[PDB]
UniProtKB/TrEMBL annotation, chain A:
<dbReference type="GO" id="GO:0051893">
    <property type="term" value="P:regulation of focal adhesion assembly"/>
</dbReference>
<dbReference type="GO" id="GO:0070062">
    <property type="term" value="C:extracellular exosome"/>
</dbReference>
<dbReference type="GO" id="GO:0120220">
    <property type="term" value="C:basal body patch"/>
</dbReference>
<feature type="binding site">
    <location>
        <position position="209"/>
    </location>
    <ligand>
        <name>ATP</name>
    </ligand>
</feature>
<dbReference type="GO" id="GO:0071346">
    <property type="term" value="P:cellular response to type II interferon"/>
</dbReference>
<keyword id="KW-0558">Oxidation</keyword>
<dbReference type="GO" id="GO:0001525">
    <property type="term" value="P:angiogenesis"/>
</dbReference>
<dbReference type="GO" id="GO:0030016">
    <property type="term" value="C:myofibril"/>
</dbReference>
<dbReference type="GO" id="GO:0150111">
    <property type="term" value="P:regulation of transepithelial transport"/>
</dbReference>
From TrEMBL, chain F:
<keyword id="KW-0558">Oxidation</keyword>
<dbReference type="GO" id="GO:0001525">
    <property type="term" value="P:angiogenesis"/>
</dbReference>
<dbReference type="GO" id="GO:0120192">
    <property type="term" value="P:tight junction assembly"/>
</dbReference>
<dbReference type="InterPro" id="IPR004000">
    <property type="entry name" value="Actin"/>
</dbReference>
<dbReference type="GO" id="GO:0031625">
    <property type="term" value="F:ubiquitin protein ligase binding"/>
</dbReference>
<dbReference type="GO" id="GO:0071346">
    <property type="term" value="P:cellular response to type II interferon"/>
</dbReference>
<dbReference type="InterPro" id="IPR020902">
    <property type="entry name" value="Actin/actin-like_CS"/>
</dbReference>
<feature type="binding site">
    <location>
        <position position="148"/>
    </location>
    <ligand>
        <name>ATP</name>
    </ligand>
</feature>
<dbReference type="GO" id="GO:0120220">
    <property type="term" value="C:basal body patch"/>
</dbReference>
Length: 371, 77, 345, 331, 78, 366
């Protein structure tokens, strides 16, 4: 039968099948349970609205956001997002198709064992595997060795991978990502005299970011080209009949990644975070990582990101180093594409954990099966 | 207290709420907040004189709603 | 014959060694045989532990012949035709590294069961007297076994002086394969002796510590990376075992009469063996093969004491989880090879 | 003259040190040539020319020196002090001249171009000395990063400025000119103490001036007020090329500028001039018949003479320092 | 030049060193090479029953004035 | 009670509201309706029409100042108000613009369509040129309006555009973008598509200028690269444009470059200034307005003086007036005409049309 693959990540869940060159369904990771009896009053054998429709009705249905930082947190509300994945959306049964899952970088041994349990104990899966998002975002690009910069809605990470193995002594997590930008962009646009509310009029602002925003190679040159010329300005027509102007706020938004001080944080940006993760490794493997940096994720999808990640890692690094930045255009879904691949491979028939080894060993088999 | 104006080479006025004692590095810090310009790229010129970072708005007789001026140091390239 | 594709795609792996072979051959058999076969498996354990890999392979290759009625037919085409090509790089031999860091926690396991830390509280006398320049004893008693490790690991401070006499008389320590290239500490999380950047189970991982980087001089005159290609090791030939015997010898001679001298000497030797493969300092062979030296056995064998050498009976727990590692790594390569013979397409 | 050898071995001597220490050794048509080459940072022509010379005339030369000077014969822009003095002295040499290569109003006319070319905020001048001419032409920074930019991009050399953005502040110094703050100096040259700026090198640039012109001392990395000067000079050329001696006028304009950018602590000779020795900028001049001597002078004796004295007192002490610490080391 | 200390070996040969309390053990180990010929990688300095570390200063260990440290040269026989 | 001002022009329709500085929207004058049945999913008009082109079949209603097909101008007036200005034309009065020498019937169907298809409360049409002159503070003079598809040299004496003198050159920016392209195709560069044509429009309206003397720069160019700037094509191609710069705007001065056997804009303006009474020629020569988007090349202004002052009597002051606000002076002409307090009475009241027909414009609009 065919496989089912899911990327429980950050804000949005990418699900579909193996072989598919694209995720069939990409919905949120939100669960919206009731606010007060009176909304349960009503109709339904349904308690919570999960996913795409939770956000539609949410002043009535108060919600939970599980896994917003990559690690699951609510294991009851996550049984739900996997129901809007193989049941009420992406419809075919869990029992019929084998599932590949993607854990966050550095997933706790315990959060792992529940996915193994929830999968066999609640979903009767034939077989299961839990892998790391980043190990699979490199298999998309055809690599088995290198460093990944996975960026989602809420968690960004730098994961070194030496032969399928992300090296835990060097996994670094940034915790600044997609929302932190939209919210900066909201605020830096709220100051331009083009204000937006912080309750759902801010999705219009999530559209200016992906659509009309880029990483600026020299922020400081980029600032000068803005106060002398209207050559860098672009225009947005709001869904509410208002056309606006953007400019400097465009490139100031994806700078939070390179320079995190914009949000008040005292952390270090992706270029620093990448160097520090490469050097938390041995000198023998550092060369194969500098030349193999995969920008994966969707916050890593601003045009120019790999040209600033060349300039910012060429400057931070030794001079004998080749820095190849690989940002395939499908970085938005590279954890996916590579989960589709792993699962469509024919040598993989073995690693899927079987329900026969689940019953014999427990959910403490993920550790001895998944790598 | 007071309000001062700063005009760029595109012709845009940024408005600042300052005091006669605010340093020029304080004004240069308010333009980083409101506009993003690192405060080092900012060069401020009132009176045909580039202003000093350790000096105050009343050491230069900027007062009222005075238009000051801003250029961005193009470096690194 | 379905789940045996895996044990054959593990042989398409270029890096299969002697250890990987046995650890898979045995599982293929066990998971295909089921009987009368528990003198094979218990013995293959003893053989794998002693690093007598082909004494074991001869059993497998023949078993495969005697029980070919039972055996899947073409596995031995690939189980064999692979066996002649087997070697062990003692740099890259971490199936055994996993094994021994597991075997180290199970050697500790059994030692905690023998709680009588009397010997360590009375080896605190051989120390003081045998090695004069160091802070005396433990400053206090040995109450736990983690402070017994501390004592045993203070016999490193007895070095380059009191054991130099005993390091001569050794026909093997002159044959060290170490280096002074002086590579220095790197981060790791893989436990014990295994490599920092080598797979590990999410449940064996210990916290991140900076561990050393030690290399091999490959221009030595048969000094153990070639004498024993099998042993996986970090820094060769111990070095402080000759310093254990300085403490132990005067101890054993003072407390030779005490009736549980064996009960208290194997404890010292086995705490050492284990707390070195557990702390990363050495490998079993690096600690034992120093003591398998005849001159060292002398005082032991004249005190009517023997050495188990940290040998144990139920290492099925340790054999296992080493089988799953090899599997995880071997078909690991496969997905990788098929990933890249699809990228090149 | 055996200390003109001891002088050479111990120090971090560089190419300027070599030239000066050797030419005084020899001195004590070929020499004036070497002085037409030093000024023009043409140091490899000379080291070999001098080296062949030490062979042409080995007569009246001691042979310890030929055997050392051939042997030891690197200029680090960061610390090359032997050019730093020479040029700080030339800055004042060119200066003396422009007051005796007089003017009444070659700058009083150029005002018309400042006020016109850059009138947006900047001071509008409304000049009877050569410090008010300086004050005027030194106010060409007020044309900043706006009108200068159109022609800064037509530059191949420019984006190789090896200046850092790490501004490190102002340090005090009593040394005039391209200088070094903690620099040995003569008690006759030291100037009233001021705060002198500290800038540093990026050195992560590729093909940066500092890497490719290692002969130019470092004070800022290339100069970009010069393009602004050339913005004001084009208007002057335009409105004053029918003028008979504007070719004389314009020279002092750019010769006072290089005069004043070397003694006011901003730039090395070529950090100001090899920006203007770019084909596109001579073109403004060349097509108006204004060939430019970029300040190369005839009486260069004055500076070169004192540099050798500076070098000697630097090379010689370096060594007594080693003999003080080979006498105190040996204790 | 302001903290004379002493390094005793296994011969009893007490060497005399002039250091400061902010000097690292690698700096001491360098001076025991400049005066003795021993590469800093054979040296093993022990004060307080401790193999001192090479990044730690003399006052990360209480090595004060005229304190006796110990040198055990390593027979890394290669 | 906000009036609307719309410049239907060959090319861009610049439209807005009466009081302010600049047009709200300046979208193209284009209508697209499809060719096959991928229609399974009305009309597409504007930037959409050009974007969705590939399925749409475009018709260009105003491409010479004249409206032509009207069932398609009804749709660029729909877009203007309903989906660009976002207004109901029924409540807001309007100001439309017309071409010089516009056919009468073609100004009766604008009255109809505004009063019968949009219910304008009131409307008025003025000539695009009379409006570019009012923005300049002038009621008497000569406007040259060169926008995208037509060039007109229109004399105006006290608000009235003299129809006996109005001359028209159908050479303009549509043609100019296509010359830069052409002379650059013969440079080694590739300009063929309707998407590479737009870039040539950017290279043109950003890098091209008019010279005061053609030959004395063609020389400046072939001996000295003091003109060759560059241009970053957004697909990684900083290309070289030198002589090609001024050779484009000057095909207006030498209409023979494009094959046109006509008179350049410096000559088309002499004949128009002297097809009028000798008595007013002094007020035209000292009142030449350069309005338009093709009259927006740096140096077009001073070149008109050279050229006109040499084809003219020497006692005539020539004053070329090129407001820096040239591109949209026809709009700002109405943004100010319509906003005038006295103008309210010159509106063709909806009522009046109903009563007098669309032949009213002729008795209100002039």
């Amino acid at each position: 039968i065919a496989a089912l693959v899911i990327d429980n990540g950050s804000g949005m869940c990418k699900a579909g099948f193996a072989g598919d060159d694209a995720p069939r369904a990409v919905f949120p990771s939100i669960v919206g349970r009731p606010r007060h009896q009176g909304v349960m009053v009503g109709m339904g054998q349904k308690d919570s609205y999960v996913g795409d429709e939770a956000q539609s009705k949410r002043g009535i249905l108060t919600l939970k956001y599980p896994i917003e930082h990559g690690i699951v947190t609510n294991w009851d509300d996550m049984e739900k997002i996997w129901h809007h994945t193989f049941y009420n959306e992406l419809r075919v049964a869990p029992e019929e198709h084998p599932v590949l899952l993607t854990e966050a970088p550095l997933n706790p041994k315990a959060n792992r064992e529940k996915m193994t349990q929830i999968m066999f104990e609640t979903f009767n899966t034939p077989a299961m595997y839990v892998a790391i998002q980043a190990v699979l975002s490199l298999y998309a690009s055809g690599r088995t060795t290198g460093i990944v910069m996975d960026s989602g809605d809420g968690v960004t990470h730098t994961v070194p991978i030496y032969e399928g193995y992300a090296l835990p002594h060097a996994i670094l997590r940034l915790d600044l990502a997609g929302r932190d930008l939209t919210d900066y962009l909201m605020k830096i646009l709220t100051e331009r005299g083009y204000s937006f509310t912080t309750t759902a009029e801010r999705e219009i602002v999530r559209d200016i970011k992906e659509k009309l925003c880029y990483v600026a190679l020299d922020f400081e040159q980029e600032m000068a080209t803005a106060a002398s010329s209207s050559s860098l300005e672009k225009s947005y027509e709001l869904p509410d009949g208002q056309v606006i102007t953007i400019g400097n706020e465009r490139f100031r938004c994806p700078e939070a990644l390179f320079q995190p001080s914009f949000l008040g944080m005292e952390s270090c940006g992706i270029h620093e975070t990448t160097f520090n993760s490469i050097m938390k490794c041995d000198v023998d493997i550092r060369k194969d990582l500098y030349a193999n940096t995969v920008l994966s994720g969707g916050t890593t999808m601003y045009p120019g990101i790999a040209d600033r990640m060349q300039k910012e890692i060429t400057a931070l690094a030794p001079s004998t180093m080749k820095i190849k930045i690989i940002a395939p255009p499908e970085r938005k879904y590279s954890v996916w594409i590579g989960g589709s691949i792993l699962a469509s491979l024919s040598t993989f028939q073995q690693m899927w954990i079987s329900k026969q080894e689940y019953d014999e060993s427990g959910p403490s088999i993920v550790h001895r099966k998944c790598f | 207290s007071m309000q001062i104006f700063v005009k760029t080479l595109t012709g845009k006025t940024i408005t600042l709420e300052v005091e006669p004692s605010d340093t020029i590095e304080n004004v240069k810090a308010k333009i980083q907040d409101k506009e993003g310009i690192p405060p080092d790229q900012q060069r401020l010129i009132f009176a045909g004189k580039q202003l000093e970072d350790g000096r105050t708005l009343s050491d230069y007789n900027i007062q009222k709603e005075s238009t000051l001026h801003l250029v961005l140091r193009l470096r690194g390239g | 014959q379905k789940i045996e594709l895996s044990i054959s795609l593990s042989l398409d792996s270029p890096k299969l060694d002697e250890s990987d072979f046995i650890l898979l051959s045995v599982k293929y058999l066990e998971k295909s045989l089921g009987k009368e076969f528990s003198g094979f498996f218990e013995d293959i354990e003893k053989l794998y532990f002693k690093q007598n890999y082909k004494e074991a392979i001869e059993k497998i290759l023949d078993f495969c012949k005697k029980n070919e009625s039972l055996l899947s037919e073409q596995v031995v085409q690939r189980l064999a035709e692979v066996a002649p090509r087997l070697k062990s790089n003692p740099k890259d031999n971490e199936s055994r590294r996993l094994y021994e860091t597991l075997y180290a926690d199970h050697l500790e396991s059994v030692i905690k069961q023998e709680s009588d830390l009397s010997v360590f509280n009375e080896l605190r006398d051989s120390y003081n007297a045998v090695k004069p320049e160091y802070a005396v004893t433990h400053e206090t008693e040995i109450k736990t076994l983690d402070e017994a490790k501390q004592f045993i690991l203070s016999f490193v401070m007895l070095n380059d002086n009191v054991e130099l006499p005993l390091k001569a008389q050794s026909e093997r320590y002159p044959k060290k394969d170490r280096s002074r290239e002086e590579l220095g500490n790197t981060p790791s999380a893989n436990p014990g002796i295994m490599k920092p950047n080598s797979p590990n189970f999410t449940d064996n991982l210990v916290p991140v510590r900076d561990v050393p980087k030690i290399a091999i001089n490959e221009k030595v005159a048969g000094g153990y990376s070639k004498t024993k290609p099998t042993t996986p090791f970090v820094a060769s030939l111990s070095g402080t075992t000759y310093s254990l015997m300085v403490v132990l010898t005067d101890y054993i001679e003072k407390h030779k009469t005490d009736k549980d001298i064996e009960k208290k000497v194997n404890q010292i030797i086995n705490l050492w063996i284990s707390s070195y493969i557990k702390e990363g300092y050495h490998s079993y062979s690096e600690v034992v093969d120093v003591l398998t030296e005849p001159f060292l056995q002398s005082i032991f064998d004249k005190a009517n004491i023997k050495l188990n050498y940290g040998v144990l009976d139920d290492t099925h727990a340790e054999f296992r989880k080493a089988q799953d590692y090899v599997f995880g790594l071997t078909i690991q390569s496969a997905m990788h090879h098929e990933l890249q013979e699809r990228f090149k397409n």
